[PDB]
Structure formats: C-alpha cells, structure tokens
Symmetry: D2
Subunit: 169 residues, 4 copies
C-alpha cells in the first residue's frame, strides 16, 4: 500500500521535490516509499530495486531535465525492467512525473513528456496537474534556487492526487 | 454512465474504429455514446455537444492523422471547450486515443501523442494499450483498406479498458 | 526570395510576434511575407495562399497554444496542403515555430513541438533558438500582456536565423 | 569534413543501420566517421569522444528504442556534453536520427522524436526522410531480423541527405 517516488538527483533539486511529493502521497491516504538510483559510468535516499517497482500501488518518476530527456542513471534503472513490462506489470497502476531544470530557455514540458512515454509503454495510467504534465522546478544556473511555496504546493498536490487515484483504483 | 467516443472521419476509417471501441465500452460495463463533429470551412453519427463532454464518465478521442496532428474539425470542437477546462471538468475522468493513417512512412504515434496533450490539459487520466499510446489503423493510400481481426481486437480492448477504468474510478 | 511568416492570431499576441520575426527576416537578408488565415466555422494581415507556401525560401509558423496544439484555423489551412506534400515541396527549405499562451501552468514547448511535426512531414529542416524549439510569449490571462525587450529580441533572432539559413542553403 | 554517425547498439541492429547511413554520407560528398559508446553500469566500432562531436560537420544519432527513449549508454555520453552546449557548438550543424525496435506494438517515432529534442537544445538543424522523423528498423522479438532492401535504401538516403545539407551549409 505504497506509492513509489522514484527519482534521480545531481545537485539535490529533484530530491527535495521527491520528499514533498511523498508528503502529498501521505496526505492522500498512502505510504510514500521514496527511492533513488546509483550513478552510472563506463569506468541520500535508499536505492530502488526491481521489487520496489513490482509492488507499488502507483509511481511518481523524477529527474533533472538533461537535454530534453531524463537523466541517464534513471534511464539505466528503467532499461533494467524488461521483466516487469514483459509480464505486464505496472499495468493499471497510476503514475506521474516531475522535473527540475537549471535553465531559463526551457525543456521541462518536453522532458516530462518524454518520461510519460515509458509509463504508457509499461501500460500505466498517467495523470498530471489539473506545467500540466507534471510538477516542475526552476533551479537557476547555480543549481541553487529552492522551492517556492507555489512549487511545494504543486508537488504535494500531485503526490496527493496520485495516491488518491491509486486509492480510487 | 456512458463513455463518449468522440471522433472525426474523412473517408470513414476512423468511423469504423469508433464503432468497435463502442463495442469494447459495452463489453466493459458502460454505454457507448458515439459522436462526431461537423466539417469546418472559411467559406454518419450524430454531432457532439459540449454537454456530451461535460457528462461522460470517460472519453475516447479519434481522428485521422493529418500531418502529425489531429484533424482540424475535431480541433475546432475542442477549441470550443474553454468553459469545461476553466471550471475544471473532464478532470479525474479516464481517456484514450485512436487514429487512422493513409500512409506507409508513419505519423500515428506522434498524432496519438499530440492528442493526449489536451486531455492532460483538461486534467484527464490517460491510458493506452498495455501502438502503445492508442489504437491505430493503416488505411492504405486508397483510404480503402479495412480493419483486420487484429485492429478490431485492439479497438474493443481499448474501449473495454477505458470503460473498466471509469468503472474502477 | 522571401520567408513566409505564416500565423494565426485570436487576440493579436501571435500577430505582433509575427511582425518582429519579419524584422528578423529582413535583418537576415530576406523579404518577409507576413500572412494569416481566416477563421473557420461549421456555421489584420493578408490571407495566405497555397502559392505563398509553394514559393517561399523558408517558413515561420505561428499560433496561440490551444490545449497543447496549434489553433484550428491554422490547422485547417495546412490540412489543405496535400498537393504540396505529395509533389514533395517545402522539402529542403528551413522552418521555425512560434507561439503565444495566456497561461501560467504551461503548454508552449509541447505546442511548438506539435507544430514541428508537420514541417518534418513536409520534409523541412527545422531550427530553433540556440524556449529552445522556438520563440514563445506569455500573454497573461487577460490576453493583454505585451512583448518584452527580451521576447522581441528572440523573435527577430529566430527570424534572422531562419533567413540566414535559407541564405546559406 | 566528416559526418559523425553516433550510435549505441545492444544486439547489433542499430550498428548495421549506422554503416549504411555512413555509405549514404559518402555518396553525399562527405567522410563518415562511425562511432559508438561504451556500456554503462553502477557496478565493434571505435568509441566516440567529445572532440569527435566538436569537429563534425553534422551528426546522425542512433539507438535502439528503449521504452520510448534512447538507450542509457548513449544518453550518458550526451549528458557529458555540457561544455559543447555551453560554448554553443553543434549550433548550425545538421542532424538526423535513427532507431531500431524489437517490437510490433510501436515506439520508434516517439523515440526518434525524443532524440531530436536534445539536438534542438544543442541548436542543430534537424532533418528527416521526405518514419518521417528518421530511419527506422523492426528487429523482431528475436532481435534477429535483418535490414530490407527498403530499410537499407532509407538509411543511405538519410545519410546522403544529411551530408548534402552539411555541404549546402
């Protein structure tokens, strides 16, 4: 009976968003299981496992926007979920996304969008904020800037909405 | 207690897909209300109304792929739904998409994708087929080619899944 | 030897962006031919023609964001360009997009994105701003708010870049 | 005076597509520099370097479709190109994409699409096939199935078109 809040964070912006979403989830009648993934190479929160994904009632996926796509260490953990898609899990379970960007120009909607693609592959029901595809944060080219009362509200709103939908389902 | 199957059709390909989805919906424990929209200019099934959208338990949206986007007469009917977004309806209700293309090259996924965008704006919960974003049909450059046993299965599957989710919700 | 700046405007926000882009185009060594399209129904700048599109050296496409997609009257004019895609024109010619939104939440990137899809169908070379997919404007829920020195800079930058690329090509 | 054909391959499908594109590039008046990237973890062609990307006249990017996104080892190599975006390179240079999928359902257009996002971030001019966003290959759930005369034609066509555009630029 938990929503998995699964994310990756480089300079900790996506990490705080994760926590707030978790609060939302709790407010929504569910236990938040907040997890991350390890760095990758060719040469914090606890690390997520396949079984974490297999057993969640629903999922919130987070990454910093990295050139319009999700961060590779997260992509790496998902690339290792064939089994779960093949036996058709995550199917039926609700999901949402969230992102952080260190950039004025843009790139969050599209990244949120690119992260809903796989969830729709795993056959999940995707929901947003009524950005509209998911919770977003501007971090400022310092990576420094902190959430606002507004961004905090949106994170919990989404977390709460995700949990309530898993409930209603 | 009905799923609105809302679509536009030029040469009737999307129209047959609509019907099959409707069958799915019935199989799924719901009444299908199948509707279309009128042609637009500067100079079949019954026509949809705003109240049709306001009162549905859930929604299936269909168009032929027209240069990677949905057909304008459909876009025109949606552009007239501000009121519904403003008072935040459709929110919470499930939705799916479907498309027809007269083309080898491609363009269906992207069009399905571009049609899920607005549903996520109106705050809906979007579901696919576990293409993966929605039911698709190749019509062949004649516009002629008919559904297969396979494409028919997918249409009802989606319709049934949409209705069952509205149910579970 | 002209770049077609083709757009639709409801409350004139996209219209001013069009003009500025046109200035950019001129700065870039090209004549701007600024055109719009007429309203559509079931029951300003000059109107664009098919031949306007056939003969341009390059293209800038503009719309207000309407539920994550381009405005229907524009979609309607493009839907009438089969001939041009079929005989494979626009192919090789550069193109860019621009948008206006009356909304805080979001929706511009995705709309810009959904408008680059067709250009890639017609086989065009698409370029952005080095949002990153094209020039954007927040209009404020009044539709009232005017361009900034910043948004103005971006519009001409894009127009200038589009024209220069058509040049280099 | 070379087009960088940059790709990742798991079971060698994207690898053959790379080679064919390279042939295209040669036919188009350019030297193909075909490169890949190493596997990533938490615990063939030569490997690409940052300087390979810095000095190309243009770029073709390839991956297998991995849940609607590009493969993580490729994403990892791109995530290490901040410097190049920051000093605004790749800007002005043409680019294309290509993909392989082991799947009936779908996912190639969207993945091609998700790979054009970053290229548009790095400020590149993106071109397709006049799928329409780039060259695609069905590998069959064996990963086994080989290119067709048709898919081969498309790969070289794209490679040739990419090189010719870099030429014209």
């Amino acid at each position: 009976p938990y929503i998995l809040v699964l994310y990756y964070s480089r300079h900790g912006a996506t990490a705080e968003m994760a926590r707030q979403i978790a609060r939302g989830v709790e407010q929504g009648g569910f236990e938040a299981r907040v997890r991350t993934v390890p760095a990758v190479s060719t040469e914090g929160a606890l690390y997520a496992t396949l079984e974490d994904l297999k057993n969640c009632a629903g999922l919130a996926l987070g990454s910093p926007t990295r050139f319009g796509n999700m961060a590779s260490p997260l992509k790496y953990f998902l690339d290792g979920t064939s089994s779960l898609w093949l036996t058709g899990s995550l199917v039926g379970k609700p999901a949402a996304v969230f992102t952080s960007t260190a950039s004025l120009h843009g790139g969050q909607e599209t990244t949120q969008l690119s992260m809903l693609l796989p969830l729709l592959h795993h056959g999940m029901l995707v929901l947003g904020i009524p950005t509209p595809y998911g919770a977003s944060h501007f971090a400022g080219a310092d990576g420094k800037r902190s959430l606002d009362e507004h961004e905090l509200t949106l994170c919990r709103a989404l977390g709460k909405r995700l949990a309530e939908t898993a409930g209603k389902l």
